[PDB]
Amino acid sequence: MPLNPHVEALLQMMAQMPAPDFSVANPAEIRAVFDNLAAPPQVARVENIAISLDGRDLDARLYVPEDADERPALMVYYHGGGWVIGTLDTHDGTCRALAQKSGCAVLSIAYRLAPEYRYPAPAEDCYDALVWAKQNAATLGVDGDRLAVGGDAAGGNLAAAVAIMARDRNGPALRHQLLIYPVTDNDFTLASYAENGGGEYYLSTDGMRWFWGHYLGDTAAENAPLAAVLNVADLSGLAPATVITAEYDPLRDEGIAYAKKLDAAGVPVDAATAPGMIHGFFSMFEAVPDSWEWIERGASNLKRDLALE
Amino acid sequence: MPLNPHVEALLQMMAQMPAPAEIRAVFDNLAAPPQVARVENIAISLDGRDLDARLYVPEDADERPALMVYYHGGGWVIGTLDTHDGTCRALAQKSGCAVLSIAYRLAPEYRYPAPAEDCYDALVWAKQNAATLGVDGDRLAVGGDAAGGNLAAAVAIMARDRNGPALRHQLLIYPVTDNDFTLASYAENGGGEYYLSTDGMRWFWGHYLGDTAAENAPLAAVLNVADLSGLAPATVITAEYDPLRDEGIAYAKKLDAAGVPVDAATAPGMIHGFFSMFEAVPDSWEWIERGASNLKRDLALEHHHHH
Numbered sequence: 001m002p003l004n005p006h007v008e009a010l011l012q013m014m015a016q017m018p019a020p021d022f023s024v025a026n027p028a029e030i031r032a033v034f035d036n037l038a039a040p041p042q043v044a045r046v047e048n049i050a051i052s053l054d055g056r057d058l059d060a061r062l063y064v065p066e067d068a069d070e071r072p073a074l075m076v077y078y079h080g081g082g083w084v085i086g087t088l089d090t091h092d093g094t095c096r097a098l099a100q101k102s103g104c105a106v107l108s109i110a111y112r113l114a115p116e117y118r119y120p121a122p123a124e125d126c127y128d129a130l131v132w133a134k135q136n137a138a139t140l141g142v143d144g145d146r147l148a149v150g151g152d153a154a155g156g157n158l159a160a161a162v163a164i165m166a167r168d169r170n171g172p173a174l175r176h177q178l179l180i181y182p183v184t185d186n187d188f189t190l191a192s193y194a195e196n197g198g199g200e201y202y203l204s205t206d207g208m209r210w211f212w213g214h215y216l217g218d219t220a221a222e223n224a225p226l227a228a229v230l231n232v233a234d235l236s237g238l239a240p241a242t243v244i245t246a247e248y249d250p251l252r253d254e255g256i257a258y259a260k261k262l263d264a265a266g267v268p269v270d271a272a273t274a275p276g277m278i279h280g281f282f283s284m285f286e287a288v289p290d291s292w293e294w295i296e297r298g299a300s301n302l303k304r305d306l307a308l309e
Numbered sequence: 310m311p312l313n314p315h316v317e318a319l320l321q322m323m324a325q326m327p328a329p330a331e332i333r334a335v336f337d338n339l340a341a342p343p344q345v346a347r348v349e350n351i352a353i354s355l356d357g358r359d360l361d362a363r364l365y366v367p368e369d370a371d372e373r374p375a376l377m378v379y380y381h382g383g384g385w386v387i388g389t390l391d392t393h394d395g396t397c398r399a400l401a402q403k404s405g406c407a408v409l410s411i412a413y414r415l416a417p418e419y420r421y422p423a424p425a426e427d428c429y430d431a432l433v434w435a436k437q438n439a440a441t442l443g444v445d446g447d448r449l450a451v452g453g454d455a456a457g458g459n460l461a462a463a464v465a466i467m468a469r470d471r472n473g474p475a476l477r478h479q480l481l482i483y484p485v486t487d488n489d490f491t492l493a494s495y496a497e498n499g500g501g502e503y504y505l506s507t508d509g510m511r512w513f514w515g516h517y518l519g520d521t522a523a524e525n526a527p528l529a530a531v532l533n534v535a536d537l538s539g540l541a542p543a544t545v546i547t548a549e550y551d552p553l554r555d556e557g558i559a560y561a562k563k564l565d566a567a568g569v570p571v572d573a574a575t576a577p578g579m580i581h582g583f584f585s586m587f588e589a590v591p592d593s594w595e596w597i598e599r600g601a602s603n604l605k606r607d608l609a610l611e612h613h614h615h616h
């Protein structure tokens with residue numbers, strides 16, 4: 001029986017990886033190379049946390065990075081997955097990566113998912129969770145005065161909405177919003193949807209129709225102000241943003257767009273499209289070494305806006 | 310910029326894989342660590358030393374589940390709770406049993422027999438502290454991959470010889486059982502193009518034994534133990550393109566010959582370490598499932614009427 005084709009593709013992929021050319025095979029070197037290969041990014045502590053809110057319990061996970069401060073700043077993170085899928089486990093690597101590179105604690109929220117809980121519910125979970133974290137800051141062991149929200153894809157959509165909710169509802173003061181290739185609108189005619197939406201690049205335009213439909217259900221996009229945050233008339237007074245888009249992401253244009261509108265309304269923004277990258281690439285750092293550059297970039301903005309002043 | 314070549318290689322890797330509640334069931338389980346209900350970082354205080362441990366309790370385990378005590382691989386020199394986290398989650402999930410992953414002390418800092426005595430002592434702790442762990446101390450099993458399967462095999466032998474915890478199973482995943490590098494699979498598979506090399510194994514063995522000759526290390530080269538009878542029923546899963554294939558098979562044959570019930574097979578087309586590769590190689594799941602299924606059978610819950 002010949003080599004399993006997938007094992008072959010794995011071996012090829014391991015072979016095209018950045019050499020760690022330690023000059024000699026001693027136990028410390030071999031250990032570092034195997035840990036780099038086979039373990040998720042190291043953090044000091046990971047705590048499975050139950051968040052009891054009015055009406056509902058949400059699972060969450062606290063990541064505390066090695067060499068963080070006594071009481072580090074916190075970013076409350078919202079996984080992506082089109083408001084329909086995604087778990088704490090699918091984004092465990094991404095949260096660890098961000099925590100490691102920012103030196104910030106990261107609290108990842110398992111908000112309730114559509115269609116079971118259609119739009120207003122998931123964003124209310126995410127907002128109520130940021131509130132919970134603020135009010136239980138000392139109990140988590142973090143500084144609730146240095147708060148951020150972040151998220152990828154649908155999660156970036158939720159983080160933008162929470163930032164809006166926190167400004168409108170006069171909630172937790174946020175030092176940053178980290179938006180990683182975020183969903184911002186349901187206009188599927190955009191250039192990048194034609195260019196990138198065929199399914200060739202993981203995420204497809206039809207996927208996004210499917211997601212949006214499950215999230216909104218019977219609500220009209222126009223009657224869903226925290227869904228298409230791109231359509232929010234006024235984006236002034238929002239937390240400083242980082243908006244990283246990907247070149248071959250169907251969401252690229254609308255994400256780029258939102259960043260422009262934030263910059264228009266006065267919000268400080270670092271905004272970049274990652275060359276050669278697809279949707280979901282923050283989560284692909286194990287196979288795509290170049291993902292780390294952009295992870296480091298976003299975390300570097302967080303580390304700056306969350307500094308103990 | 311052109312599409313990133315690592316990204317493009319990843320994309321064709323996904324494309325190379327065949328095929329709301331059902332949709333989540335699939336996509337949540339690709340490129341992600343398998344979900345379990347509870348994961349607890351545990352410290353084990355033994356005589357002379359404290360070991361790190363991690364307890365995995367899967368979804369839909371019994372009120373007081375069976376326990377497999379698991380020993381990671383890494384040639385007795387490398388590996389952590391973190392490097393084998395994914396593997397432990399997969400086995401807990403597919404078996405329905407709790408899994409206790411043990412961070413035994415590593416060679417060359419701690420040479421044979423130290424890592425083995427850690428692994429045995431951790432089993433005895435787990436049985437003694439079953440109420441503390443919330444598991445059923447009468448439904449115990451050991452397991453491990455590579456040098457971890459070696460340690461599991463050695464522990465099953467020690468538990469037998471020392472009137473130690475009764476074991477219902479030993480799951481041995483492409484185990485190291487001997488340092489005979491003359492064997493066929495080393496010549497065929499031990500070149501280095503298949504992850505593990507004969508040279509790698511020499512290195513590991515050198516670090517593990519130190520000055521001690523193999524002939525004086527029966528709990529290391531378990532293939533040189535005379536009487537394997539009365540040992541825990543075994544699963545021994547080897548890999549076609551693994552240098553360790555042949556000594557794994559040999560150990561299985563000797564288990565069987567001694568009257569130990571053994572499920573033994575060679576995963577066709579697979580390399581050393583493929584149980585840990587299930588995110589990239591979904592066909593690994595077939596073998597994970599078989600191994601975990603044998604665990605589940607031998608760690609069977611007792612009868613309870615439901616009326």
Ligand SMILES: O=C(N[C@H](CO)[C@H](O)c1ccc([N+](=O)[O-])cc1)C(Cl)Cl
Nearest residue numbers: 038382383384455504505581582585
């Ligand atoms: O023993 C070794 N690796 C073993 C292979 O069994 C280890 O079990 C392992 C390999 C790969 C892996 N992964 O890619 O997640 C995890 C563990 C050495 Cl050759 Cl580095």
